Assembly symmetry: D2
Homo-oligomer: 498 residues x 4
């Protein structure tokens, strides 16, 4: 009768109408005589401990909630597949791109950074775009965003950035004062601030936005030659955005606009698609780059590094159970198959450690046993062993020590990583005084036109109006360093707001 997002239970009943309803069992499978009333001493007496069904149900209900992700809590998920359309075997030996036509199952989670589990979808926020590839050589987690860059470039400032973006520790209120204080004290965030406050900041659903790995990745081919690559997945449905008033109205109407849109589009046969590209940079070009090639704030221009098509991402399956397949899913950037490796990108290096720790915290030590996280296209044969909530044979009676003389699993020499000589001094290097203005200026002048610049300035001024006077002055100084037109228009809008 209605759209698929509301007829879920009617569809379930139609699907399971011929068969009889299952009997009501306890946790241990004991059938339940009654589940409407509790055992009491007469009509008006106290409760009995002997109500094992009540105790079981109440205890399980008391433990429903697991810790939410520290970032990207609110999200929507889907399942699909990946198809290779062109040969990039000259760059990487990974089995994902081994030949043309090789389908590969994938899982995708869309999310917002600062939004909590009960927040609205249509808000001004960078969007999370996490893709998991189920491959015969284990799982590969491409955890990207809807933006090629990020706010900061050094890992130790990520918790401070998240704290500044989140609620005030005392009042529990979202605070543009902290937001703009951090943004002005770290001027490298100007590029991402411009990207977020442009019209692309509030996309019209998850099907109308691009995805970027944002990191330079290392591709090793069969000969051992290594190149540096970027990852872009571009939507085939077209880029579409929403206005501020429309975003606020959608937020007040339905906070789950993105989830509902994705669910309906998938259930109506309107499968969203993304085209997979790469940008390959050689070692020589990495040495001769005008900036740091591994800088998270920098992009690679399309003129010197043209996009090369690789494959296509199609999402064609809604999650059966949201908690089972979306809430419990974990993306580990360290999960990289042979042929793809990490670069000296400091942010990526920090992410290599950050994610498994929080996954063990919020999902348990054995979270890789969860079906959505399992590499079911492979076998996990190693010397890892006993853990909390270990529902596996625990690899049976196999030896749990290595090396051994009893035919236990053995390492494969071909999986050894690429080696690069690194010369220098092991110390902390100050990098806040780097170049932060030229790419932002190029984006503002060349990429943006008059109306988009006006909208960007209006959005920045509207968000910054609630900050303190000196914070606004510092932000204005940064914007003026970017461009005098930027700074002057922002100052004028702020002055009329005051």
């Amino acid at each position: 009768s209605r759209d698929p997002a509301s007829d879920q239970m009617q569809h379930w009943k139609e699907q399971r109408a011929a068969q009889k309803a299952d009997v009501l069992t306890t946790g241990a499978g004991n059938p339940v005589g009654d589940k409407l009333n509790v055992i009491t001493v007469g009509p008006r007496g106290p409760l009995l401990v002997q109500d094992v069904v009540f105790t079981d149900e109440m205890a399980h209900f008391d433990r429903e909630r697991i810790p939410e992700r520290v970032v990207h809590a609110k999200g929507a998920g889907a399942f699909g597949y990946f198809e290779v359309t062109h040969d990039i075997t000259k760059y990487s030996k990974a089995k994902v791109f081994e030949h043309i036509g090789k389908k590969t199952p994938i899982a995708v989670r869309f999310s917002t950074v600062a939004g909590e589990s009960g927040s609205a979808d249509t808000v001004r926020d960078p969007r999370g775009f996490a893709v998991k590839f189920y491959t015969e050589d284990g799982n590969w987690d491409l955890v990207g965003n809807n933006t090629p860059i990020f706010f900061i470039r050094d890992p130790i400032l990520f918790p401070s950035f998240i704290h500044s973006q989140k609620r005030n520790p005392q009042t529990h209120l979202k605070d543009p004062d902290m937001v703009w204080d951090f943004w002005s004290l770290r001027p490298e965030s100007l590029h991402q601030v411009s990207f977020l406050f442009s019209d692309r900041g509030i996309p019209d659903g998850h099907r109308h936005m691009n995805g970027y790995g944002s990191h330079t990745f290392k591709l090793v081919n069969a000969n051992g030659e290594a190149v540096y690559c970027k990852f872009h997945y571009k939507t085939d449905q077209g880029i579409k955005n929403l206005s501020v008033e429309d975003a606020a109205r959608l937020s007040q109407e339905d906070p789950d606009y993105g989830i509902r849109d994705l669910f309906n589009a998938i259930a109506t046969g309107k499968y969203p698609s993304w085209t997979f590209y790469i940008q390959v940079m050689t070692f020589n070009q990495a040495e001769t780059f005008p900036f740091n090639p591994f800088d998270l704030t920098k992009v690679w221009p399309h003129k010197d590094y043209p996009l090369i098509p690789v494959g296509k991402l199609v999402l064609n399956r809604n999650p059966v159970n949201y908690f089972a397949e979306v809430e419990q899913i974990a993306f580990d950037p360290s999960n990289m198959p042979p042929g793809i490796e990490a670069s000296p990108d400091k942010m990526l290096q920090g992410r290599l450690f950050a994610y498994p720790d929080t996954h063990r915290h919020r999902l348990g030590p054995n979270y890789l046993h969860i079906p959505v996280n399992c590499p079911y296209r492979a076998r996990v044969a190693n010397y890892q062993r006993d853990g909390p909530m270990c529902m596996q044979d625990n690899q049976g009676g196999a030896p749990n020590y290595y090396p051994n003389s009893f035919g236990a699993p053995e390492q494969q020499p071909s999986a050894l990583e690429h080696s690069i000589q690194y010369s220098g001094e092991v110390r902390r290097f100050n990098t806040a005084n780097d170049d932060n203005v030229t790419q932002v200026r190029a984006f503002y002048v060349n990429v943006l036109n008059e109306e988009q610049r006006k909208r960007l300035c209006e959005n920045i001024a509207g968000h910054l109006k609630d900050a303190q006077i000196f914070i606004q002055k510092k932000a204005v100084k940064n914007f003026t360093e970017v461009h005098p037109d930027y700074g002057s228009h922002i100052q004028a809008l702020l002055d009329k707001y005051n």
Copy 2:
């Protein structure tokens, strides 16, 4: 502007003289640098010897604790309780022992279905939980903004919460589930009528009443027991908001209640609530037309007049929201001598439910958290080692009872009241009970024409998205309540469809 916006300026001015403290790690080792990571060369990989980076990242990775399964979105405050009248005849508890006895309190305001990132101004019953720090230990009065509840049997609470919350597959709200449960359980008609009225969306936490909603037993020094209700009525006046204003406030600031409470407390506008009771004797409990322990039944003020007890004043904001509001736990089983529980099935179920979820959400030793500590009581027992054992594990005291070495001893005075019951211990079907007359009286007498019209409009607006047969069942229940109720609701639904 508001003090909440000027929080950091206030914090800076609070020192105004002291230089910034040194930056230490978790173990107190001073930090040489906290802006850059240790790398080999300008463009090299990270090194594991960055102990400060590993510590900060690991602590950041574990910042989130599980949210409460219900009443997740909350606002808290601290204050005190003052006794204004003598009710020592009914109860011997030291909270009401004498007039003028100040007593520290802590309260939390919350919404039932609202998750952590949700808007305050939403049509939802409001949580009003009060904790009393008393020399006889802590007392948790976990009330609501309504004198009643939707259901009356404990085993249906998880089903009700599931129906109120997201769809398991689509993760979307389902009025289909909400109204299916409401129509299949007609006892929720009274609370539904209360919620879909003007009082459903209050204008801040300072403009709503609080109700324990349960019949409690008061035992005096002689052992004579009575049944009592608890009402705390706002002295600031009852204030409500329209649906358009509620939606606009939700779109503007989801934390309107938190901000309003914070500003009112910080501006010297301390909210107050007047404490009352409704005492019922044993015989009147036998002569009550309905079940006196029914959660869907109130006691009319004509036969059970309100009698003032004290006043609740909130005059302090939380210093740290996570430390004093997120980590606070309210256990209804925490009852001092002189107050006990009744055979109210819902209360009996809560007595077991709350400590379990507190041990899950905060940890086995959650009573060692400062906000949950009974710092007016000298705790001494035989409970021992647990995860994050905190204070002293009670030292070298014997950990078994009884013993011959002067370990803590039970005192006979704290013995509970003894009442005899007769009957067969079995499950009793109590869904066919009376559910109509109190709702009918509230609709006809308490409300007027415009309030009934608004109530019907709100119910129709919420119910229009349900399926046809669910709407028909709900309409039949409303017609059973009153033909005019049912007919107006059905007309509005037909216009909506």
Copy 3:
């Protein structure tokens, strides 16, 4: 060769000699190229975060320890089956006894009460005998002991008893001072103390001891008539015991004597067997019992309540992985199928609440999805849809609320429990003087002969010699109340020891 326990890895290698050694993978299935050395900059340089395999394996190593059971930590497990031999369908309608010859899979765990995971098997301690039945009506957990009785009779004293049996809170040393202080202050433990310090207190392996449910259970047949029953499983291998010197010597030589003995006996075709009996008591007989029929410190004499054979317990399978099948197993006495229910036995009522709580703490909220704990002979269907490490499909998109109009699982009236009318007053009743002497006197006089009495007195005196003078005097007073011969022999031995 040697015992099969020592040849485990040789057997494993012989079994897996016809198959290629598995490749070494990470947690996510990524193949490992070098698991012998860490990534270092140069030969003598610092470690780099890039060792994703090192971090993952070390993190899993850091979390392999789950909390040990608060009691019965040291354990040995086995798997087998239960065969019905006779007809008891007149007493209970449970499908576990429905027909003759109906095989039923079982799992058992043998344990000591006060022993930790690192302690010796051959010590003086009541032995745990927990049996799990996998039945089409869900799992049934018969959690018995090697003694028909217990130390106490009121559940609020169980933590105090365990504390007195365990280490001193300050010195972390065993304290017979606290042991005998609690024993003397609780005279009801005299029967259990006599049983424990008799010859059968130190059994020679788990195959040479009996098992007792120790509780009166309610059996409901198809007509609704309810009787009270006991459960006895008697070893077919014979009752064999060990001396104090031999027990100490075996403890010194090998702390895992029981585990090794059970493993070798099962692996050598020496399947241990236990014969299953019941002791049925009617409502009128319970009303006319000389003592409390529900008292945990009282037995039912075989003359008035003859044992009726039911079936046989055979163990014929060793655990494949000890942690997976013995450490992670959980026995819930509340897991009772229809036809068997609990009695007003206060200890049993307390256990009904105690066990699931500690299981959720020790394993986790979803511990029933662990394969050893799954009711794989039952089709579980309920409305519990959440949990840390949700491992099945979370029952898909089925409605999570009850009642409903969409064909969700429904309760069946046939599982409704038995109802009795209990008259009285709801209050605490002091029950410390329920004739704690007559059964102990009867046992000591009739069951034990002169040499066994002498050995029992020697054992009690040897254990009590380290207590204080007043504690010894109180214990001697209790033993004299039991019998003057008991008291005089114990006091003479104590005076010789002091």
Copy 4:
């Protein structure tokens, strides 16, 4: 009266005879009326959920156990102080060594590696010697052992070594087969094996053994000049050991021999003492060392690197609660104050990451709020925020992001580390074919005499007799590579044993 280890409770009662016994309260401080009987309807009725005190007590008892340490589970603890006796300010700028006479509180935990919680003290095992210093610059954890060296030299093999030392995954029994298989496949463990099977392998209590940091630590003085140092704490009570028969007898009598000995010695005014030494090595000597100066299997001879006294360790206080002060204590080697830093020792680098992870696992994310782990001699201010069991004010309303313009805590420039130029290709370097024989040979010939070598061979043969033939042959080949006398004596003893 007996010794304090048994008169604990009597002394506790004597200390509190002149005060009324405290009332019995619940967890929330509500007084308890009756903690001896449960509330039941009538004399013989079912239990009722109204027993809030019973539910609280049972629930807290059900969660009494925390996960045991993956290694060094069985332990004994004590508290004392550290006194500086000489001037080492030229090597390090640490305030712990700042000047002479500076008393400093310390905490010490003694433990066995493979021993589990319920295991005997007198067992052949390397002994743990962990020292925590409470200083004004935070806590310093010197986590050493009773041996200057270790079994292996590469971090990734530590879990395999622990698995080989611990119980069989299937039979849950100890396996000398696994032990000697790992030992023979890793010949670098020969030095440590000789040390462990020498006479000092089973010390007579914790007061009669030395302690070694075993790692080369780097000391930075005020000028930034860095040196490499070792740490030795040598007992002033004398080195005393026990025979195999005596160790077995002590194990069968009392498994807590070490704990009891330490407790009695401290309570009787017999304070044990250890003298603090260092071995300083310069950069040039490290470059010219015949072996790897950072190798965990190599020592520094006293002729070239003489010991230089620093201070004294005195333990003069028993714990007042074993769980509160010994079980909950956590030692983090990364907790190093300014003036002391780590070296490129791979094992130390691995420990720096390993320890905090397992501490957060087994004690909770906020385990530094536990009083024994708190740095109460230093003031703590940082941007770490909300966690489970936040047992402090959570630093109030201070800003939770850095940098900021509101006077939040600031980094101290003088605490910056020492930078050393490091060159070489970032890759895994094999460390198995290194030199593993000459130091063991020197120890065997010079340090050991005839009877000591005979005892060492007897002990090794007694342990190795139960291994397989090929494992024994490989071990014999390793011992022959060490010395022909070693190999021939071991093989002759093995042939006599078989």
